[PDB]
């Protein structure tokens, strides 16, 4: 149903400086439409198709939309709607802060909590929430992307395979310690994502030794409040980093808090 004919797309240039896979900007000739195209021998086919598959099952204004697949023969294609301003981390880092103000940061957070409220409702789990995995478009629209590790959950947790390796700065302690992933682990990451946004794209736990992060977190260390970050947003941010997953807010609560702030 989603399959398309590779001949349809014209591939113009490579897109990402090598950081996101083999992704090129594409022009769908017959529909006159700019699109992105992720392509894959690179023994990662199993996991590419898994990705192509999950994007068929989800649809939200703040999640990057699949337009079509070529997954009948190689090279395999993933054709998504094109976000002309790229990933959020570099956007924040390169933006004009007179244009991207505190209001715009709040808007970006609200839109992401929207995407995550929807996955939470769908009992899906993203597993790689971070500014580098969000994309920016016209009028400061932000959309969550990169669903390679995403899953529909059979119950309330998913256990990663032995020896899986994770981005530690974004990973919840129970995920580091017990390979346990849940919507509450996605909430932990969201918090770190909020800190990335608050700081216009700074690196979390700057200059800390990764092998000390768990240790520090268990002893209670958490990242300090960024300058300009409002107290309510910092309180919410800290809520996402509660040790016990149960004590963390839901994505519904979080989104309610930002929609309210976005008004007041
Ligand atoms: C998916 C997507 C990506 C985009 N747009 C862009 C745009 C972009 N830019 C490069 C630098 N200029 C200055 C800004 C635009 N760099 C990337 S880098 C990039 C490429 C691919 C993916 N992810 C996927 O293709 C998989 C999830 C389907 C993420 C980031 N993606 N539109 N839609
Ligand atoms: Cl790339
Ligand atoms: Na961590
Ligand atoms: Na905390």
Curated annotation (Swiss-Prot):
Coiled coil: none annotated. A motif (Kinase activation loop) lies at residues 146-170. The active site is at 128 (proton acceptor). ATP binds at residues 15-23, 38, 81-87. Phosphorylated by PDGFRB. Polyubiquitinated. Polyubiquitination of ABL2 leads to degradation. The modification Phosphotyrosine is found at residues 20, 24, 158, 178. Residues 9-258 form the Protein kinase domain. It is found in: Cytoplasm, Cytoskeleton. Changing residue 238 to I: Somatic mutation in a lung squamous cell carcinoma. Widely expressed. Interacts with PSMA7. Interacts with CTTN. Found in a complex with ABL1, ABL2, CRK and UNC119; leading to the inhibition of CRK phosphorylation by ABL kinases. Non-receptor tyrosine-protein kinase that plays an ABL1-overlapping role in key processes linked to cell growth and survival such as cytoskeleton remodeling in response to extracellular stimuli, cell motility and adhesion and receptor endocytosis. Coordinates actin remodeling through tyrosine phosphorylation of proteins controlling cytoskeleton dynamics like MYH10 (involved in movement); CTTN (involved in signaling); or TUBA1 and TUBB (microtubule subunits). Binds directly F-actin and regulates actin cytoskeletal structure through its F-actin-bundling activity. Contains two distinct classes of F-actin-binding domains. Although both can bind F-actin, the 2 are required to bundle actin filaments. Belongs to the protein kinase superfamily. Tyr protein kinase family. ABL subfamily. This is Tyrosine-protein kinase ABL2. It comes from Homo sapiens (Human).
